[PDB]
Structures are given as C-alpha cells and as structure tokens.
Amino acid sequence: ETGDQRFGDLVFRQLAPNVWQHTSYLDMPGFGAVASNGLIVRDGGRVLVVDTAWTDDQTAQILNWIKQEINLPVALAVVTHAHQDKMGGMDALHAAGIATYANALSNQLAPQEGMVAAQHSLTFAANGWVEPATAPNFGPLKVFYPGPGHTSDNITVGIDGTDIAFGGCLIKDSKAKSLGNLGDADTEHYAASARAFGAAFPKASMIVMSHSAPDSRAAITHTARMADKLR
Amino acid sequence: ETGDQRFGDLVFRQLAPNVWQHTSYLDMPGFGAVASNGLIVRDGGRVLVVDTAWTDDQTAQILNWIKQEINLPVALAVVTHAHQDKMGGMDALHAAGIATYANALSNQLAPQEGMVAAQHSLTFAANGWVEPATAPNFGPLKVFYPGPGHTSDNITVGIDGTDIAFGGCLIKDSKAKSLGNLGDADTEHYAASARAFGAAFPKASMIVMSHSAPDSRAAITHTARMADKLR
Numbered sequence A, B: 001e002t003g004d005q006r007f008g009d010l011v012f013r014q015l016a017p018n019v020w021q022h023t024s025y026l027d028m029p030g031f032g033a034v035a036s037n038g039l040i041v042r043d044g045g046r047v048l049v050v051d052t053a054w055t056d057d058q059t060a061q062i063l064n065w066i067k068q069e070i071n072l073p074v075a076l077a078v079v080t081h082a083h084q085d086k087m088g089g090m091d092a093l094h095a096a097g098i099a100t101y102a103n104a105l106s107n108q109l110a111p112q113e114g115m116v117a118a119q120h121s122l123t124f125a126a127n128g129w130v131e132p133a134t135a136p137n138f139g140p141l142k143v144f145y146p147g148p149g150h151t152s153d154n155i156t157v158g159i160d161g162t163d164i165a166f167g168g169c170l171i172k173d174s175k176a177k178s179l180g181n182l183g184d185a186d187t188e189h190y191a192a193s194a195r196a197f198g199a200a201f202p203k204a205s206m207i208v209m210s211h212s213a214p215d216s217r218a219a220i221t222h223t224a225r226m227a228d229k230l231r
C-alpha cells in the first residue's frame, strides 16, 4: 500500500500534514490477522493519540514510532470504547506517564471488559458533544458521543483543521457486507447513532474507522442503512 | 394497600415521614393494568419528585395530590430512564413549572424513544456517582448510574436520611420469575449493574422499584442472580 510505512509489526500512513493512521494486527480464530486503526495528531509542539493498538507491546511501538518520526511528546490519548482493539494497550500509555481519557461509561465498563480504565473520564451533553471541562487541552480533537451503536459507550473524534473524522468501530466502509462485531451492540439505536456522527462532522470528507481503510462520507450512510435492517 | 390514598387514577403510599411512593397504571394490550412506581420526597419547604407517571394526565394528578396533601412547591424532578413509565409525563412537569433532570443519555435517546427530554442533563463519573455540578440543590437525593441494565441509561436514587433507595426499572422484586421487558436491555452488564446499585447504597434496607411493591435488599441480589443467567 504505497505511502504506508512499516515499523516493526505496525503500519503508519500519513493522512494529512499533521495526521497519521496507526494500524496494528491481531491473529483471530476464524478470521486470520485483523487490522485495527487509530490516529496520531501533531498539534504544535505535542502529539495526541486516538486509540491504543490491540496490545501493550504494539502500543509501545506506536510511542517509539512517534519519537522517531515526529519527536514531540505525547500529551494525551483518547480511547473510543472499552474493547481490546481500542484500549488493549492502556498499560503502555500509563507506563509512559501519558494522560488517558475515555467516555466515563467506557471507564465504568472497562473491568467487565478486561480493560484497564483510562485515567480520566469524558462526559457529554444531551446533544452528544463532549463537555469541554472534561476534555482539557484536546486541541483539534473534537469528541462526539453519537449514541449507542457498536457499543453503548462508543465515541467519535473529529480532527479540527482537517477534512478528517474518526468513526472508530461505529462506522464500516461502504464496501462492508456486515457491521462486524455486534456482541455488545445496541441494534435499536445504531442507525440513528451512525447518522448523528455524520451530522456532527459536516466538514469531514475522509472518514477513518477502526477496521476499514479510510473512505468517503458514503461509509456513514451505508453503515446507517445496514443498521436500519437491524430494527 | 391498607392506608393507601387514591387521587384520580393514582395511588399513594407513605414509606417514611417525608417519602411517598406514587403508583400509576397503563392498561397494556394483552397483559392488563401495569403499575409503575416513583417517589415523592419532602425536603424542608419543597418537594422533589422521582419519575413521572405513564401519562401527562396521570402526572398532573400526582402534582395535584402533592398540592392538596403536602402543599409545598415541587422544585425539581429527576426521571430515571427514557421509557414511558418514567418520562411519559414530562410535558405535565414542564407545564407545571418544575425543573427537570435526567441522565444526559436519557435526554439524547428521548426523541428516538418517543419521550420529551428533561431540561437538564446529569452526567456521571466512572464510579457511577453523579457529577455534582450537574445535580445542583438535589438536597437528600443521591443519584447513581449503576451501569447499563434494563436500559443503557437507567439511573438510581438514594434518599439521604432514610433507609430508602430507588432502583427504578433495573431492580425486580425478590420473588420475580423474570427481568421483564429486556427489549432495550444490556444482557451482558445487567448483573454487575444491579450489584453496583446495591454497593452504592449499602445501608438502604427498603428498595423501591418501578414494577413491584417495596422490598428488602433481597430484591437486589435476586435481580443480580437472574441477570447472571443472561450472560
């Protein structure tokens, strides 16, 4: 995939001058190697991370890659729900003294989901927007809770100053034939939540997501239409 | 129901010097009348309400019983999830000038659930406790989000200075043979959420719930044991 950089067993792709996608892989029984994507954002003299890799050792390699390619300190990480692809590498962040943030519900669920909770909890208004007091110095990361979907706690992140919005595991690409792992999903509200993400980030033309390469806005509508079939 | 009062279609039962249960009924298509309970709390010179009745008219009857029998202003109501038994009467509360509070997630889901949102949104720390700035002047009402269960947004309320805690629709009585309406339930996390409610209010000995008469703490552990079988 031209423009991908391999760094150990992780892949990094630059999406914009100050934004990269990090990709890590799990061997899955019945699936083979499964990719999970998150984001790295350079914001002045600091770096902000969205989502861990699947494991601590892989997440440590994200930090090493950041040191080598960007060489600015990581100020914080946001993790977008309590599943292993997103929070499996929390100990690597905490070992490195990085402040971590998740939906309060993600932190509340983390023990039952076998995840380490983030240090800090985000809360949200009734319209889905993060309460700013709970997202200190998030810079360009604009966090939106679109409602229950892939999980009840899934959050999304727009990257202000860019055309990029991150749908996490709520959004699948427009070529998807399924909505992936629905084990913890809210099948009643998933469609409205997918639609709410699209309405929250109207400027976004590149939709990044956990288990698909970046796609256009059609990923959002296609996802919402697949979810409509669950109701 | 010796000692119970009737006002219109509503039934009232005093649980403590300053606490009453309100009960309203919806005649459902193919079960018959279904009771739903909430609370009325006298807090010095004001009244606090937990949950509406099923309908606006029934909710107005609650408020008129309060004016007749207690004759103190209702300062606020907190509603415990976005279903009709708990939020069906929001328009009546608002017509009466009562400030209304609900979990932010209840307010967000309310349109899809066919409910009117409360005015103000409660948010919660990762340990379940309400963030106090979102619950100003709640007096003895201690609001705790135990985690997803009967619905993702269900909240619970303890009344300081009494032996009473209100589980809403998360908790079923100790002789129940099922967990009732699981249509919007989180079957994976329900049992832990029920236990969390018990842990939040460890000294409560009277557990009030939406669809049975008050029970002892046995209701909490029975509900959790039933929920264990969902996993």
Ligand SMILES: O=C(O)[C@H](CCCn1c(-c2ccccc2)n[nH]c1=S)N(Cc1ccccn1)Cc1ccccn1
Pocket: B028, B034, B035, B083, B084, B085, B150, B169, B176, B177, B178, B179, B180, B181, B182, B210, B211, B212
């Ligand atoms: O929870 C149930 O399914 C309904 C009550 C469900 C109440 N409800 C609703 C709702 C229901 C109808 C219309 C609008 C809203 N939204 N959220 C909740 S909550 N319950 C029967 C039951 C109980 C136990 C086992 C099986 N069914 C009420 C009940 C319980 C015990 C005795 C008599 N009635």
Ligand SMILES: [Ca+2]
Pocket: A056, A088, A090, A091, A116
């Ligand atoms: Ca670990």
Ligand SMILES: [Ca+2]
Pocket: A113, A183, A184, B188
């Ligand atoms: Ca799970």
Ligand SMILES: [Ca+2]
Pocket: B056, B088, B089, B090, B091, B092, B116
């Ligand atoms: Ca109404």
Ligand SMILES: [Ca+2]
Pocket: A188, B113, B183, B184
């Ligand atoms: Ca519903």
Ligand SMILES: [Zn+2]
Pocket: A081, A083, A150, A151, A169
């Ligand atoms: Zn997930």
Ligand SMILES: [Zn+2]
Pocket: A036, A083, A085, A169, A210, A211
């Ligand atoms: Zn995922």
Ligand SMILES: [Zn+2]
Pocket: B081, B083, B150, B151, B169
């Ligand atoms: Zn309900």
Ligand SMILES: [Zn+2]
Pocket: B036, B083, B085, B168, B169, B210, B211
């Ligand atoms: Zn109920």
